[PDB]
Amino acid sequence: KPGDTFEVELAKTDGSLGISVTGGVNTSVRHGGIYVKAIIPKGAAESDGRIHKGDRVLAVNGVSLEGATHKQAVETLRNTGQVVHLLLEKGQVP
After folding, report:
1. Torsion (CA) 60, 27, 67, 75 in degrees, nearest 10
2. Phi, psi (5° rounding) for residue 88?
3. What Rg do the C-alpha atoms of the chain give, in angstroms?
4. Which residues contact 38 (CB under 8 A, 6 or more apart)?
5. Residue 33 pairs with which residues in a beta bridge?
6. CATH number for the domain running over 1-94
7. How many CA atoms lie within 13 A of 26 on its CB side?
């Protein structure tokens, strides 16, 4: 089955996470959520590997990302501190 959850208790590697996330509700995509587009080589999140491209994000540091737009999640991740507490899910579609 798809759809295994993880809490990602991630610390940055000198100011980098390493995630390119996209999506939202109001834009082109019907699906209504924030998704991983790509994983930035030599990132924190990148090398961790609980996060990987094509996953679905649930929450950022408490904040439920469902209903948030493309900008919001990006700005949210940008405005993260040292230790970053994510929640995400291992795939919708295989």
Report:
1. 30
2. -145, 170
3. 12
4. 19, 20, 53
5. 24
6. 2.30.42.10
7. 7
Q: Look up residue 84 and give its two tokens.
A: 């970053």
**How far is Cα of residue 46 from the mean position of the Cα atoms in its chain?**
11
Alpha-carbon torsion 45, 19, 89, 58, what sign? positive
Exposed / middle / buried, residue 8 (Cβ in 10 Å: 0-12, 13-18, 19+): middle
3-state secondary structure of 88: strand
Domain boundaries, the chain: 1-94
Largest CA distance in the chain: 36
Helix (H) or strand (E) holding 11: strand 4-11
**Amino acid, single-letter form, for residue 53:** K
CA distance 31 to 92: 11
